[PDB]
């Protein structure tokens, strides 16, 4: 199930970020790997539940998992997090509508795999760009298990017995986020409960100007208050797969620069960052 490696073979190179446990970069067996060491006795019991599930998981769009001190040797993602690509430190990279749709497609593919596992369906819950990593020039997306109110479905923080349709709600928000390149619910701000109150009362991110109706339809359905009215992840994957015909160029690495300017979208309607001109063009060739 999992390869057993000791700290002697590992070679720690440099620190990365600050998760729940602290993450460090390393090189083991001629492979770059990210390691999440524990520095607490209380946090060791989290490993016991997670290692049973994470060992069984194996998917292209999910992070791969390759003992004293207790650690998890995972594969290193050169591209960083999706949040950093979208809103991070300058210089920000350029990306197109093809990349945005491809990221969401690969994300739905990974979550569908988790939903369909046996015996029980694994729910990710905390699905958000900071946990979506990128590799291969920012073209392949990788999900990683373990202020999230902006991506959290209303029924979750309400305390109701949530289902796996809470991930579908998160995906909907992420779809709005990559198309607009805006932080969802940034204008609200404040503490977390002020966003929860908004989402609970029906507030959603503003509509996007010149957005294709099929994309607008899938996005809003994912936003619906009733979890049963949201589509399954299998449905999202299938729809997103057939839409990519009209979004070529998703394998092109991110290498061109982008200078950050954000116009304030007034009148409850925002401009998209990506451009859909090529989509409407290719859509006309097939349809008429
Ligand atoms: C996958 C769940 C998770 O928590 O991943 C995170 C989140 C935050 C920090 C670290 C990790 N673990 C991790 N990281 C990587 N690669 C990677 C490489 C670079 C970065 N940074 C780029 C520079 N800025 C300044 C900060 C972010 C982040 C992550 N690969 C695999 C894992 Cl498990």
Curated annotation (Swiss-Prot):
Quote a single Gene Ontology cellular component term.
plasma membrane
Q: Which disease is it linked to?
A: Frontometaphyseal dysplasia 2: A form of frontometaphyseal dysplasia, a progressive sclerosing skeletal dysplasia affecting the long bones and skull. Characteristic features include supraorbital hyperostosis, cranial hyperostosis, undermodeling of the small bones, flared metaphyses, and digital anomalies. Extra-skeletal manifestations include hearing loss, cardiac malformations, and stenosis, particularly of the upper airway and urinary tract. FMD2 inheritance is autosomal dominant. Cardiospondylocarpofacial syndrome: A syndrome characterized by growth retardation, dysmorphic facial features, brachydactyly with carpal-tarsal fusion and extensive posterior cervical vertebral synostosis, cardiac septal defects with valve dysplasia, and deafness with inner ear malformations. CSCF transmission pattern is consistent with autosomal dominant inheritance.
Question: What residues does the Glycyl lysine isopeptide (Lys-Gly) (interchain with G-Cter in ubiquitin) crosslink join?
Answer: 45, 128, 165
Q: Where, per the database record, does this protein carry Phosphoserine? A: 148
What is the active site of this protein?
126
State what changing residue 128 to R does.
Abolishes ubiquitination
- List the subcellular locations: Cytoplasm; Cell membrane
Q: How is it modified after translation?
A: Association with TAB1/MAP3K7IP1 promotes autophosphorylation at Ser-148 and subsequent activation. Association with TAB2/MAP3K7IP2, itself associated with free unanchored Lys-36 polyubiquitin chain, promotes autophosphorylation and subsequent activation of MAP3K7.
Give the result of residue 36 to W, as annotated.
Loss of kinase activity. Loss of autophosphorylation
Which GO terms of the molecular function aspect are on file? ATP binding; DNA-binding transcription factor binding; histone kinase activity; identical protein binding; linear polyubiquitin binding; magnesium ion binding; MAP kinase activity; MAP kinase kinase kinase activity
* Protein's name in the database: Mitogen-activated protein kinase kinase kinase 7
This protein's major location comes to cytoplasm
Q: In which tissues is it expressed?
A: Isoform 1A is the most abundant in ovary, skeletal muscle, spleen and blood mononuclear cells. Isoform 1B is highly expressed in brain, kidney and small intestine. Isoform 1C is the major form in prostate. Isoform 1D is the less abundant form.
Q: Which function does this protein serve? A: Serine/threonine kinase which acts as an essential component of the MAP kinase signal transduction pathway. Plays an important role in the cascades of cellular responses evoked by changes in the environment. Mediates signal transduction of TRAF6, various cytokines including interleukin-1 (IL-1), transforming growth factor-beta (TGFB), TGFB-related factors like BMP2 and BMP4, toll-like receptors (TLR), tumor necrosis factor receptor CD40 and B-cell receptor (BCR).
Q: Where does ATP bind?
A: 16-23, 36
Q: Name one GO biological process term.
A: stress-activated MAPK cascade
- Asked whether the keyword Transferase is assigned, the reply is yes
Q: Give the family from UniProt.
A: Belongs to the protein kinase superfamily. STE Ser/Thr protein kinase family. MAP kinase kinase kinase subfamily.
Q: Which residues form the Protein kinase domain?
A: 10-247
Q: Subunit structure, briefly?
A: Can form homodimer. Binds both upstream activators and downstream substrates in multimolecular complexes. Interacts with TAB1/MAP3K7IP1, TAB2/MAP3K7IP2 and TAB3/MAP3K7IP3. Identified in the TRIKA2 complex composed of MAP3K7/TAK1, TAB1/MAP3K7IP1 and TAB2/MAP3K7IP2. Interacts with PPM1L and PPM1B/PP2CB. Interaction with PP2A and PPP6C leads to its repressed activity. Interacts with TRAF6 and TAB1/MAP3K7IP1; during IL-1 signaling. Interacts with TAOK1 and TAOK2; interaction with TAOK2 interferes with MAP3K7 interaction with IKKA, thus preventing NF-kappa-B activation.
Instruction: Give the keywords, sorted.
Output: Acetylation, Apoptosis, ATP-binding, Cell membrane, Cytoplasm, Disease variant, Host-virus interaction, Isopeptide bond, Kinase, Magnesium, Membrane, Metal-binding, Nucleotide-binding, Phosphoprotein, Serine/threonine-protein kinase, Stress response, Transcription, Transcription regulation, Transferase, Ubl conjugation
What mutagenesis or variant effect is reported for residue 138 to R? In FMD2; increases autophosphorylation; no effect on MAPK signaling; no effect on NF-kappa-B signaling
Q: Where is this region: Interaction with MAPK8IP1?
A: 5-256
